[PDB]
Amino acid sequence: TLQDIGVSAGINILSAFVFFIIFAVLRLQPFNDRVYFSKWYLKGLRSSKFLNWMPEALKMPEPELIDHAGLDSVVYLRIYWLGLKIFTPIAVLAWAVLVPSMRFWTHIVMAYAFTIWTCYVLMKEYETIANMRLQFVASEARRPDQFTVLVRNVPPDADESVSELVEHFFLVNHPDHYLTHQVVCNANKLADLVKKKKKLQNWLDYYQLKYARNNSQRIMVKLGFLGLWGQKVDAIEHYIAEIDKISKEISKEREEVVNDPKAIMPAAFVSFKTRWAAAVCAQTQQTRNPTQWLTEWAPEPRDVFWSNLAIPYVSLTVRRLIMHVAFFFLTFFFIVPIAFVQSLATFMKSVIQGFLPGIALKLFLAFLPSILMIMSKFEGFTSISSLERRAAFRYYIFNLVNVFLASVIAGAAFEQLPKTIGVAIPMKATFFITYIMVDGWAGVAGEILMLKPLIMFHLKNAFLVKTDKDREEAMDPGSIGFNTGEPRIQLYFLLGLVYAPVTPMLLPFILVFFALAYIVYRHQIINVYNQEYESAAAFWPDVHGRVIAALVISQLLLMGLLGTKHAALAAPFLIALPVLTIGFHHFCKGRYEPAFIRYPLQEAMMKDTLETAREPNLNLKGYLQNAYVHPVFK
Amino acid sequence: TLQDIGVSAGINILSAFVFFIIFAVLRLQPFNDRVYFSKWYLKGLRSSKFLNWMPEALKMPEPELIDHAGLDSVVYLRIYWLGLKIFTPIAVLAWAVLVPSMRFWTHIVMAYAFTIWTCYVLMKEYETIANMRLQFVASEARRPDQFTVLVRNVPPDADESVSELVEHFFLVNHPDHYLTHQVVCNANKLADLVKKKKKLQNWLDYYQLKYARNNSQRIMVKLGFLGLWGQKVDAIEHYIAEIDKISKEISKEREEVVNDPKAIMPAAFVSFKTRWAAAVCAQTQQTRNPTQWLTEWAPEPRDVFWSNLAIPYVSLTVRRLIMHVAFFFLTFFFIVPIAFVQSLATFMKSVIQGFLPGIALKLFLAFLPSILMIMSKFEGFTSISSLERRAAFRYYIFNLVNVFLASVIAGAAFEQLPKTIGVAIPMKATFFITYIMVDGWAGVAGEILMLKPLIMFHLKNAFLVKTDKDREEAMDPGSIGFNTGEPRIQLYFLLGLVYAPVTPMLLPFILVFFALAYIVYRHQIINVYNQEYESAAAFWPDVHGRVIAALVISQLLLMGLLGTKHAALAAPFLIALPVLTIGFHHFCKGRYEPAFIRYPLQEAMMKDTLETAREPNLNLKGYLQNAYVHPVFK
């Protein structure tokens, strides 16, 4: 209804307005400058009208922002821009021809206009990102991953050690390119002990400062809620004792793990003299057995997810299969909160009952990224980049099944107290309009406040911080959040494509979101979010694939929606849409995807040549040998 | 009906019997020994009970036959064996449980038993062939294709020639492995003129010998049927004049093509010092543009299909697309002879009307392999091996659509004068039983006679042969015929899998065919059919894929056939069949296909190492430089 949309918009507009007022005040307080301007502190550049921040955010043209923030950050930001490029002319046309027999054909023709425009834009965007990636990589600084290949599933041998097997194999098969190597160690027990020691120290800092202020009897009952019914009488000496005990265990574990042959995993990081050689090893079959001596480009050391290297290669299939089943149950049992939200989705009081399903769904999905990342870690991936791309994939599917599809179906089930989809989809546009205004418009405006790190920063200063420059530990803005950023905008791309020929009035909400998100994330990318790992936009092929899937879904749903007309006869027309769209995808896959999945030998050779000419005396071996050992071992 | 099957079998059994009597007599006549024992003449080994040939054919165990005949010939023969391994226990079970509620479940369970057995056997066969291939290649003699990579779509340059561009690119990107190269030339005009000259000479040989026997006026009216209404008064001097004219054109063309820069195609055969290097070049991305400087293993020179190298790389997509359309029309318009055959398919006279549809269909399909090969040449492939694999692919599809599916549908259309497929499939088993006995049992028995080369050989001796040792040209048995061999047995694999749980009595006909074909082809492979090119069984992944497709088709058709039972409720069971089957296929694809599609670097290195140790003074450059020039240029 217009009244519910009007009120929901008024609420979300004012909410966003208020968030921007609060933001304007908070960002001018020097005590939280390290929260709002975390980058520039991390980059060594800084030390010590409420919306003016919007036009300032638009300064720093791409080339500068790429060097400042990184390629992934810029490419991610361009997705919001992609959204505006795809849907602005769609929205204009849909309004122009659907908003004041032929209506039937008009819808079919529009499906062709929308698909073609979308494909055209995706093609050009794909080409552009591929070019940005190739230029970025060619101009990128030296890193050990450019010369290093991770070797998995080294076969066992009764006499030779993993190190001996790796060195021998590569000296023989990759002669005069093989430089050095580092064998993977199962240091997980040690790493876990070290993390616990750090947590114990935080308690020591908490209680020592709390005590110093309040010089009385310590009474912590271990958990308080359901802990050990004791007192932790000193609580400081208690944690000192726990630390002393773990410290001894850690020293023992270090001596054992580095002299324990069973800590050696049949894997190693192999380094080559040239990038050309690494490019060859990473792209070629090494032996007869396709599931032995497996090679791939090593993640950069800050991207290597060390825990996953202790998983025997051969059990990875099983872990993956178990997680596929778990994923099914994750989506399966989420129907309960969906049904709840759709039940809720049914004058200033009734319009709130209308409004709230937006929030309720946002809240139920709040911890989904955590679940998806955890299950993604169980499946072994060995890198942060890979883990985030997989979590984003699973989330996208979840949103398709549970946020879009199930909401429409459950909605219809409540409305009803054949092709019922014919009315279920257009009626639910009202729900989606409100939903977008809640996790979209209001969502993004709220995110600029950065309340979580704001609070954490201050609490750490109040209770754990001891001296100067440990403020560096208190300050951590996190990364861009590809895991939630992607899946959210992809839902909107789907909704846009699904409803553009159905309900044109959904699109202005989607467009405002993309515009707002662009300016807010553009702002945050410049000032906060130091990036955890640098992929050279290797996720783009997945972004592309998800939009193509959205096109196919919309094209198919339209067959359903227009499949009620007697003698519709749209079948020989509309079927061409998913066929042509897939053809387009395969074309683009073959033409642009290699930019992202294969490193051409010519680029490797030019890079190696120039690097050598510029730095003729590079001790590459010294540089690479101490990389990829383990964060635990210094 | 039993009477039509009985008579058709009696006809085909006696026909096969007679063919084997005729064969036994013909093979003992010394004047046609070069037809029946063509190999051994080609191998330099020979010079100058009617069924005893069957037990003799079973001598020469695989290892010997592989060296004698070749790997492809042996692997092909094993397909008939694969057939017997898959269907013998299927036939036993189907007879045991279907031939004297639960019938419904019995059929579902059998689908699972058949699929599993088939997949098990295919898995083991796949593994075995992969091992045979790897062993064969490792032990294979030196050939120039082991060191040579074909480079396509060399980009244009205003100043540098294709040769200069290729040499430079490879010296820079593949330094110290690049050995030499040979640029591709558009010698097609010349090659065509040379072939015409040879045809003109054959006429000169025909008329000179005919005249010498009959010393009178020559009266050939150019074609006779619709030629030039003249006499070719001398006919010998006439062809001498045509030869003299083309001879002059050829000399001119040779001088022009080797000094014509426009005859140079942007492609070259690039040779490397090592097999390891060729393996790298052939498996790696060379430049930024994925559709430039494209590399693949060069076909051996006797496999290179030179005509296809004159096609600009960039027009290949268009040629392919045109041929896909042509293929559609080829299958589309074949419905006319299908309908004819099915119309025909409706006491010794009525049983012949029953019998003849077998023959009629065989005859209409007789020239299909020619069509498919011609259209496959239009699409550029550059090798005989590739052309045959593509022709076999298209033929397989044709058989599925036109021989199997359309026959069942057209059959039902005539029978009828909903799920009618429920009865159309089992009723047509009678047709297929007869068809198999005609192009199968009788077909193979007839092929052992080799009537076409028998006749051609004798006619050439009678009219063209002039002296000794030109009998070598008269004798040519052709190759194995993968193009017709594959598609035929695949139809039978399909029919077997489709009808095993439906009509168990189709299977004994299929089994007899596989058994007969095995012994006949085993015999011919040993004695005739010198192989045109040696693939190291690289077609196996396609054989495998076709059987998997047949499993999926049978599994799906069964849903249809059992989908008439009210409350069948077979959907959550039967759907698992194509899902599990595809899963199996992907497993096998990932585990065994690399044996056929990637050459591992370790094997390349071991091969190069051993080769060098055995022959420490190999002038590899001299060896490789004169390869792949063109058959025309000496």
Author numbering:
A (entry chain B), B (entry chain A): 3 to 50, 71 to 122, 156 to 401, 420 to 490, 502 to 718
Question: Could you pull the original sentences from the published paper?
Answer:
Previously reported as putative ion channels sensitive to osmolality, a companion paper characterizes OSCA/TMEM63 family members as a novel family of MA ion channels conserved across eukaryotes. The structure of OSCA1.2 reveals a trapezoid-shaped homodimer with a two-fold symmetry axis perpendicular to the membrane. The bulk of the protein lies within the membrane; the transmembrane (TM) domain (TMD) of each monomer contains eleven TM helices. Topological similarities with mTMEM16A suggest that OSCA1.2 also has two pores and could conduct ions through a structurally analogous pathway lined by TM3-TM7.
We purified Arabidopsis thaliana OSCA1.2 expressed in HEK293F cells and determined cryo-EM reconstructions in lipidic nanodiscs and Lauryl Maltose Neopentyl Glycol (LMNG) detergent micelle with cholesteryl hemisuccinate (CHS) at 3.1 and 3.5 Å resolution, respectively. Structures of OSCA1.2 in nanodisc and LMNG were nearly identical (RMSD = 0.81 Å). A comparison of nanodisc-embedded and LMNG-solubilized structures hints at the positional flexibility of the subunits relative to each other while in the closed state. We refer to the nanodisc structure throughout unless otherwise noted because of superior resolution and map quality. The ICD contributes the sole dimeric interface in OSCA1.2, with a buried surface area of 1,331 Å2, only 4% of the total surface area of the dimer. Within the membrane, inter-subunit contacts are nonexistent. Instead, a cleft with minimum width of approximately 8 Å separates one subunit’s TMD from the other. To visualize the dimensions of the putative ion permeation pathway, we used the HOLE program. Towards the extracellular side, this putative pore has an opening greater than 12 Å wide, which narrows into a ‘neck’ approximately 15 Å down the conduction pathway. The neck extends for over 10 Å and reaches a minimum van der Waals radius of 0.5 Å, closing the channel.
